[PDB]
Design a protein around this ligand. Sequence first.
Ligand SMILES: Nc1ncnc2c1ncn2[C@@H]1O[C@H](COP(=O)(O)OC(=O)[C@@H](N)CCCC[NH2+]C(=O)OCCc2ccco2)[C@@H](O)[C@H]1O
Ligand SMILES: Nc1ncnc2c1ncn2[C@@H]1O[C@H](COP(=O)(O)OC(=O)[C@@H](N)CCCC[NH2+]C(=O)OCCc2ccco2)[C@@H](O)[C@H]1O
Ligand SMILES: [Mg+2]
Ligand SMILES: [Mg+2]
Ligand SMILES: [Mg+2]
Ligand SMILES: [Mg+2]
Lengths: 270, 270
Amino acid sequence: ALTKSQTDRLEVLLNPKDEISLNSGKPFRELESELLSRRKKDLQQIYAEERENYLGKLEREITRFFVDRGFLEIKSPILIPLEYIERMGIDNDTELSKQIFRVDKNFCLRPMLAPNLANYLRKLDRALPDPIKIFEIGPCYRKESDGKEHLEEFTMLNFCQMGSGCTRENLESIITDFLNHLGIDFKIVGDSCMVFGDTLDVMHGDLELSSAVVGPIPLDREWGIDKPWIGAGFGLERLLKVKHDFKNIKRAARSESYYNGISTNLHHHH
Amino acid sequence: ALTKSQTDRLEVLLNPKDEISLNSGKPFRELESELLSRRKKDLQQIYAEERENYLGKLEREITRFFVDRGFLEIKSPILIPLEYIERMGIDNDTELSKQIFRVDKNFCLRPMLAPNLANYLRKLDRALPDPIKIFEIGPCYRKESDGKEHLEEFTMLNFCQMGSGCTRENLESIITDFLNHLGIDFKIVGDSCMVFGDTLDVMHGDLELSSAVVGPIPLDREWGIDKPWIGAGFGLERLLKVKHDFKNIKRAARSESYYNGISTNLHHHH
Ligand SMILES: Nc1ncnc2c1ncn2[C@@H]1O[C@H](COP(=O)(O)OC(=O)[C@@H](N)CCCC[NH2+]C(=O)OCCc2ccco2)[C@@H](O)[C@H]1O
Ligand SMILES: Nc1ncnc2c1ncn2[C@@H]1O[C@H](COP(=O)(O)OC(=O)[C@@H](N)CCCC[NH2+]C(=O)OCCc2ccco2)[C@@H](O)[C@H]1O
Ligand SMILES: [Mg+2]
Ligand SMILES: [Mg+2]
Ligand SMILES: [Mg+2]
Ligand SMILES: [Mg+2]
């Protein structure tokens, strides 16, 4: 019989495609040696052939998709003023407020892309023709209980449009074209959150890929926005989790422990 | 005569290619209106044509260069254990130690990529053939006096090789092939730093593009490295500064104030 420590170690080395059972009586060593060989060969093939990191590669694929559809690529600060949190309507006694990583006294790691993108929409409206279409991909941060679907350090895509064409129909059509491009099935369900109000959540089974919003909303005034807008935020690690059938989202994260979902800890267990 | 406030505002709107003088007596308005028109047209053309962010585009170009030359693309954590700082030989009473953004009690924003990459080298050595070649591009953080050449939030490339081929000659040859690819002239000068010891600094005039190291070094033991290695770190914003002849590195940074070196603040000054 395998101990919990042993079972945990074999789970680390097991990949979704494997058809190997941890409950069929084989000694821990036979199982560990088999899996280590498979994972070493997996890394050897990546190194010999493509050499691209899944998170980087997905960012690049997504970037191409939105640039080709007329959206401006944004790269904004990750370390942001703490004041942006308050101004997003996140009161400091709320749950999301307790998820913020504070830095020094007056800054934080951004938990979302929206405030920076709201500032870009306002500013670009002075220069660009209608409709204004922009997107950003990059790191975001939230203190979490984690579990299998949450990370403290994750990667968000947020695209948005402001001016004409900002209807629920167009928003759903963009989401549909995007997830069709990635080859991911989904449904849309109505939900709500404290910050934006009513949302359209993009679901893969019970897993939330995205929350999306059809503006305008009352918050807009605080960011100097006064036109219709639509936008959606997606977690890249969640997209990878679905695409590669990972059981735990940690396999898709920035990590020292996994590379393209393959364990980097290829020592023997004792 | 222009006030300091006026001169500063016009400097924000001026771009390197402009042949417009702020010292030839024209009223502030004539100058401000001219520059605003140029910058709006610059943004309009980016939006109509390419839509790519310089920092993102450069990351993608660099990634392709190193992947095609046999280096594995790494995406590791930005938020790292504070203990990694100590173990890099950065004592807490040193100057670099005072540049660290601490997060909670036991973490920090990484000020460099090396510790994460050292862990990857050690781990991948259990799986990959000689030589092991890896690189990472991403955000790094240092409290700075700033000025025209430093940012608190910047983007580093670090490539490294471990095993065979880890000579000064090969390191210089990679650096040369890389900067030749980017179309940037440079020289190499010997320097030294507290962490790695003797370095080879890659200079464009008086501007440091990179520090590079030929190992092994005594620090290696603390990271479980015991083979020869070579590596170099480059700032992407510094590369952009040179490529686009920016006067201030802030034009190349993740920002809400500049997009591809063009001011996003296109209001009228009073
Ligand atoms: N902990 C953790 N780990 C992994 N993935 C995670 C995660 N937490 C979230 N995700 C993934 O991100 C997606 C979106 O997160 P969310 O909390 O549901 O939604 C928001 O953060 C929100 N900002 C998304 C965009 C809403 C539309 N708003 C917008 O476009 O604003 C644009 C500009 C503007 C105008 C006025 C105001 O702002 C999760 O679904 C998950 O995948
Ligand atoms: N504040 C600020 N703003 C803009 N750009 C900045 C900046 N500070 C630095 N830069 C740019 O980064 C380049 C490198 O920074 P550095 O301090 O000179 O050098 C280092 O950080 C160092 N880690 C670079 C790599 C050295 C080689 N080491 C390595 O490859 O390790 C690999 C693994 C290993 C094995 C054993 C131990 O580790 C600046 O030149 C500037 O452009
Ligand atoms: Mg949540
Ligand atoms: Mg949601
Ligand atoms: Mg320095
Ligand atoms: Mg240096």
